């Protein structure tokens, strides 16, 4: 349809529209026109991505400002869905306006997802892929080939073919999903990664993950190309604090330092070798360092620093190199004795938590390393590596960890803590000391974003409570609200199971995981639901270890044998590719009527973007509240930090963290309003968390379902599934849950 808001014409790609979608679009436009941030929570059974793209694209195409759009999702798989929705929306616009308007929309991701080189795309880790591409694209190979054609260094035909054509002609006008982008680039032998990265400044809408906006290592290059007045959308940002914290965190092991000394020794040997034969390089670098230049002025735009900048760009010192680490050998000695100090700090016998200031003071005492040189460690190493012609950098890889640690601990002092533990795994014959640099404040990484951009929309399906995100992340919103779906007939049955058919309490507390009664009670619930679930059944566990133990217990008990008769058993595994194959099989078995059951972790890879709608999900079995491991030094430090700063009680945050994951998994079962499923929360502690669930889920949870038994939940499920299989009466939803164009106009008349 094509309807009107106060003055903005918006073309919806569907003939019908939900009341929630229209209200969602109206609120978004109000936020955009008034300026500022907002937090909008729309249910999962209502199209959110299409509504966002429909309004925002229309907004950019109508107003004189022509503000760009930045779309942030949490995983790469979501970028594809957003791009597919964008393609569908733009195709509708091209057919209704009579022409293809000037529009470019591209997704962004790593080389590993976009490498077409037959020999470099066959790697099992992205770091190696980046290294090989850099070797063929840094320009060292091209310059050597220019001087002497006989050089055996190779290139990438994809990267080289781009230089023939201009940046504005890399792709035709339109929207390019990754599936479409790779196909187009393969037929013309071009690099999708370099095409995308060189077209961000030209895109009307750019879609990437949160790691490309919050992580300083990969963000600064991308951030410098996007505009300052663009529309910023945070899609599915209910777990954004976790991304913000891992961006400024690091871990050091004994193996890391043992591998760092070898690299430092190799670096010293390389410097000596270069000193004998070709010494002009060292002097040339030293001269520029004395002048006051940094990596930006020395490195060409074609090459990248060896050590990614680990701190936010606003905290990097703009002064010249301190002079202590100005020469190659002096920096190596500086680096070596820093490694030695780290090694001697790994021999503690009890957990030590210290501020970055205390660590710096002790470092300045035992050795004589000051704060300022430590801040330039990463910046200097990238220069030394660049000037040493280090064609293979396998030896020096470990030094990137030491440099990253050095530049972090010397930069930030508030909101950061250094934990040293003699036991990474308490269940080990021999201690394995670990050193963790943890970020406690989640707003440090997101502070630049909320200041650089004027308007930001924070939207998600299960982002509740809405007051805690402004508290946790220091930002203020013009409006924060959650919509309740106007579903004519109840489509999802949320239930809470507190005990088994024997009326014995059930819980997923880790200390009683190996309990014959709780294990058998959960297994009986799994089997009984597997008997009435028609097609698909997803089961989420609080942790992977809990799932591993209980599944093994079920095998001995024989509970799995009963499940095998009705459905196939697919299990989430640590390997990502194997889990992807499990998802493919699970979907296939759901489609052909064989029936499948998928056991996954609530805080795992499956729960962070994979949706189980229609037949892929008809029942969700939340086995326990997904609490973290409370006896974690990092979490306890974060809980203490939040309590003192933001006045958040430790239990409140722990419950909030657990519920934001339980609700996260619940909302992945409804796509439209014709979708239905049963949500069962199997834990006695869930009974008092109804007020903590999202508003649209809490409204559907009845007072009788707050504490059910397994038999009483099965009987209700059987009745509900039977009821949802009947032909819905169109008149019951003709104008109360689904709107035609005429109905929408009426709603615009009565309101005004």
């Amino acid at each position: 349809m094509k309807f009107y808001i106060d003055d903005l014409p918006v073309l919806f790609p569907y003939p019908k529209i939900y009341p929630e979608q229209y209200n969602y679009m109206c609120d978004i436009k109000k936020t955009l026109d008034v300026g500022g941030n907002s937090i909008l929570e729309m249910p999962s059974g209502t199209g959110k991505t299409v509504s966002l793209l429909s309004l925002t694209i229309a907004y950019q195409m109508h107003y004189p400002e022509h503000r760009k759009i930045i779309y942030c999702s949490r995983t790469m798989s979501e970028i594809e869905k957003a791009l597919v929705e964008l393609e569908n929306l733009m195709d509708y616009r091209t057919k209704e306006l009579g022409y293809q308007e000037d529009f470019r929309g591209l997704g962004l991701t790593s080389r590993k997802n976009l490498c077409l080189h037959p020999e470099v795309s066959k790697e099992r880790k992205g770091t190696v892929v980046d290294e090989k591409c850099r070797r063929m694209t840094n320009g060292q190979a091209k310059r050597k080939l220019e001087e002497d054609p006989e050089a055996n260094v190779e290139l990438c035909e994809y990267h080289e073919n781009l230089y023939n054509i201009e940046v504005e002609d890399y792709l035709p006008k339109g929207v390019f999903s990754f599936e479409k982008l790779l196909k187009y680039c393969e037929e013309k032998t071009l690099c999708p990664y370099f095409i995308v990265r060189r077209m961000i400044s030209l895109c009307n809408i750019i879609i990437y993950s949160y790691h490309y906006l919050l992580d300083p290592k990969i963000a600064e290059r991308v951030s410098n190309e996007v505009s300052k007045d663009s529309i910023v959308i945070f899609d599915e940002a209910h777990n954004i604090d976790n991304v913000c914290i891992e961006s400024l965190s690091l871990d050091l092991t004994t193996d890391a330092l043992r591998r760092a000394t070898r690299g430092a020794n190799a670096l010293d040997e390389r410097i000596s070798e270069v000193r004998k034969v070709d010494s002009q390089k060292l002097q040339d670098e030293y001269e520029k360092l004395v002048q006051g230049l940094h990596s930006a002025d020395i490195l060409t735009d074609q090459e990248e620093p060896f050590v990614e900048t680990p701190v936010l760009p606003q905290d990097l010192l703009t002064e010249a190199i301190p002079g202590n680490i100005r020469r190659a050998e002096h920096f190596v000695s500086f680096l070596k004795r820093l490694i030695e100090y780290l090694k001697t700090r790994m021999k503690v016998l009890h957990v030590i938590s210290e501020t970055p200031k205390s660590f710096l003071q002790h470092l300045k005492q035992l050795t004589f390393i000051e704060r300022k040189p430590l801040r330039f460690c990463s910046e200097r190493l990238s220069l030394l590596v660049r000037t040493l012609e280090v064609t293979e950098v396998e030896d020096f890889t470990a030094l990137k960890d030491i440099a990253t640690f050095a530049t972090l601990i010397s930069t930030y002092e508030e909101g950061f803590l250094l934990i040293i533990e003699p036991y990474e795994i308490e269940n080990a014959a021999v201690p394995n000391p670990i050193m963790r640099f943890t970020c406690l404040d989640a707003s440090i990484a997101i502070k630049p974003v909320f200041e650089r951009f004027s308007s930001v929309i924070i939207t998600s399906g299960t982002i509740s409570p809405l007051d805690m995100y402004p508290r946790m992340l220091n930002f203020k919103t013009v409006l924060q609200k959650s919509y309740a779906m106007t579903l004519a007939k109840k489509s999802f049955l949320p239930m809470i199971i507190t005990k088994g058919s024997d009326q014995v309490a059930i819980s997923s507390r880790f200390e009683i995981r190996n309990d014959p009664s709780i294990v058998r009670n959960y297994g009986s619930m799994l089997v009984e639901f597997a008997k009435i679930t028609p097609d698909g059944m997803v089961v989420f566990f609080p942790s992977y270890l809990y799932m591993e133990s209980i599944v093994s217990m079920w095998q001995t008990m024989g509970i799995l044998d009963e499940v095998w008769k009705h459905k196939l058993i697919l299990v989430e595994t640590p390997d990502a590719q194997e889990t992807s194959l499990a998802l493919e099989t699970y979907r296939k078995a759901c489609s052909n009527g064989r029936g499948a059951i998928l056991l996954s972790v609530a805080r795992g890879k499956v729960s962070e973007g994979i949706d189980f709608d229609h037949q892929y999900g008809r029942t969700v079995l939340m086995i326990g509240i997904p609490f973290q491991y409370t006896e974690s030094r990092i979490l306890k430090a974060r809980l203490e930090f939040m309590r003192e700063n933001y006045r958040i009680r430790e239990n409140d945050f722990l419950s909030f963290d657990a519920m934001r994951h339980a609700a996260q998994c619940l909302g992945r079962v409804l796509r439209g309003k014709d979708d239905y499923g049963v949500m069962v929360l199997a834990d006695r502690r869930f009974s008092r968390k109804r007020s903590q669930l999202p508003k649209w889920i809490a409204q559907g949870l009845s007072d009788a379902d707050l504490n059910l038994s397994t038999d009483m939940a099965i009987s209700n499920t059987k009745q509900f599934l039977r009821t949802m299989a009947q032909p819905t009466d169109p008149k019951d939803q003709e104008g109360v849950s689904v709107w035609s164009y005429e109905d929408l106009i009426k709603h615009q008349n009565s309101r005004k």
């Binding site: 992205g126 990754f178 790691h211 095998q555 799995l560 595994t573």
Partner: protein, 98 residues
Amino acid sequence: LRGEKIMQNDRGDVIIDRYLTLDQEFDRKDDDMLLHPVKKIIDLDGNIQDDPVVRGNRPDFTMQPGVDINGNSDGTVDILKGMNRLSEKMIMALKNEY
């Protein structure tokens, strides 16, 4: 083959045990028989490779496969893979030449 954890105490049979290592070779040949590129919609490998330079805090032992005192695997992941492979082979067998 029944997806049950093998016990070292159990004596077993001498003759059949000779094929245990052969099965370890058949499972490898079957893992490739199932491996193939996955659609980007549900590609979980690209999500972990989205940012290849992510360095945070290593997850707790509750978010990792179980291990014993000596540090080696407890073996429960093997049976998880075994049932996963059984389901995958059954579904693949459906899409035969017929």
